[PDB]
Design an enzyme around this catalytic site. Structure first.
Site, short mmCIF file in Angstrom:
data_model
loop_
_atom_site.label_atom_id
_atom_site.label_comp_id
_atom_site.label_asym_id
_atom_site.label_seq_id
_atom_site.Cartn_x
_atom_site.Cartn_y
_atom_site.Cartn_z
N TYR A 28 60.20 50.82 71.15
CA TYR A 28 58.76 51.02 71.00
C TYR A 28 57.95 51.37 72.22
O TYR A 28 56.88 52.00 72.09
CB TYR A 28 58.14 49.80 70.32
CG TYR A 28 58.48 49.73 68.86
CD1 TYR A 28 57.72 50.42 67.94
CD2 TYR A 28 59.59 49.04 68.40
CE1 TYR A 28 58.04 50.44 66.62
CE2 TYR A 28 59.92 49.05 67.07
CZ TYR A 28 59.14 49.76 66.19
OH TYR A 28 59.45 49.86 64.86
N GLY A 30 56.81 53.42 75.05
CA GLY A 30 56.85 54.80 75.44
C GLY A 30 56.37 55.56 74.22
O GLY A 30 55.72 54.99 73.30
N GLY A 32 56.50 57.43 70.66
CA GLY A 32 57.18 57.16 69.41
C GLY A 32 57.68 55.71 69.33
O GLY A 32 57.19 54.80 70.06
N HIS A 48 51.11 46.98 69.63
CA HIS A 48 50.19 47.90 70.25
C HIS A 48 50.04 49.17 69.41
O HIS A 48 48.92 49.66 69.22
CB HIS A 48 50.67 48.24 71.66
CG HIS A 48 49.68 49.04 72.42
ND1 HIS A 48 49.99 50.25 73.00
CD2 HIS A 48 48.37 48.81 72.70
CE1 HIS A 48 48.90 50.73 73.60
NE2 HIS A 48 47.92 49.87 73.44
N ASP A 99 44.39 47.83 73.91
CA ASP A 99 45.05 47.95 75.21
C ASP A 99 45.02 46.64 75.96
O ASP A 99 45.99 46.27 76.62
CB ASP A 99 44.42 49.05 76.07
CG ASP A 99 44.68 50.44 75.53
OD1 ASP A 99 45.41 50.57 74.55
OD2 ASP A 99 44.16 51.42 76.09
CA LIG Z 1 55.79 53.73 71.20
#
Ligand SMILES: [Ca+2]
Ligand SMILES: [Ca+2]
Lengths: 123, 123
Positions: A28, A30, A32, A48, A99
């Site tokens: 997860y 990065g 995609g 996130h 964030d």
């Molecule tokens: Ca991701």
């Protein structure tokens, strides 16, 4: 935006270069992401993403042509604390919180190098 | 930058449009300024200018091609409080404090309409 996020993470983990250390980590972290998170840090990233997915389902967010990572917002880092500014309109305010929660999550979980760059045949 | 300053003032005086209410007020509020401040609000502006004048005498500030009002920096407004972010480099950090002090000064002094747009033959 991506850039405020990077600073939020450095606000909490002063010793890292978030774009390097957390990029392509797990299934997860990065760009995609799929599968079952490999660990808790990977789970912070999944959450996130879901938060960004939710942002998208808001009438307030369907005005900006730019992505959540292009959607700048304003915050400040003070004494290793993140504060999303009240000058943020509804959508930016939602992304800022997404964030902020992720940055804090990153700083509270173990980081397993053995999951860096992860063979995406495990996701 | 001018725009962060406007928000800082609204952070402290939620009911005003700083670009309208404090623009061309006295001998110092607005562009330029000379003479003896007419009142305390005008004095907040004079101080504000001196702070920007000081910013200019810093080796850190002689890199940005843009003016203190074009020099963006980051801060947040939370519960009517202004916080200059630690992600601000030296120069931006100095301008942010200059703007924060002025915004607070504005909110603590009387505003005399009888000094709005002031005949600049009194400065
Ligand atoms: Ca991701
Ligand atoms: Ca002036």
């Amino acid at each position: 935006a991506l850039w405020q996020f990077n600073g939020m993470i450095k606000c909490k983990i002063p010793s890292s270069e978030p774009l390097l250390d957390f990029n392509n980590y797990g299934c997860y972290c990065g760009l995609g992401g799929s599968g079952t998170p490999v660990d808790d840090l990977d789970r912070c990233c999944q959450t996130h993403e879901n938060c960004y997915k939710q942002a998208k389902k808001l009438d307030s967010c369907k005005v900006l042509v730019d992505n959540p990572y292009t959607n700048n917002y304003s915050y400040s880092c003070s004494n290793n604390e993140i504060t999303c500014s009240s000058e943020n309109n509804a959508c930016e305010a939602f992304i800022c919180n997404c964030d902020r929660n992720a940055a804090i999550c990153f700083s509270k979980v173990p980081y397993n190098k053995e999951h860096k760059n992860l063979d995406k045949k495990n996701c």
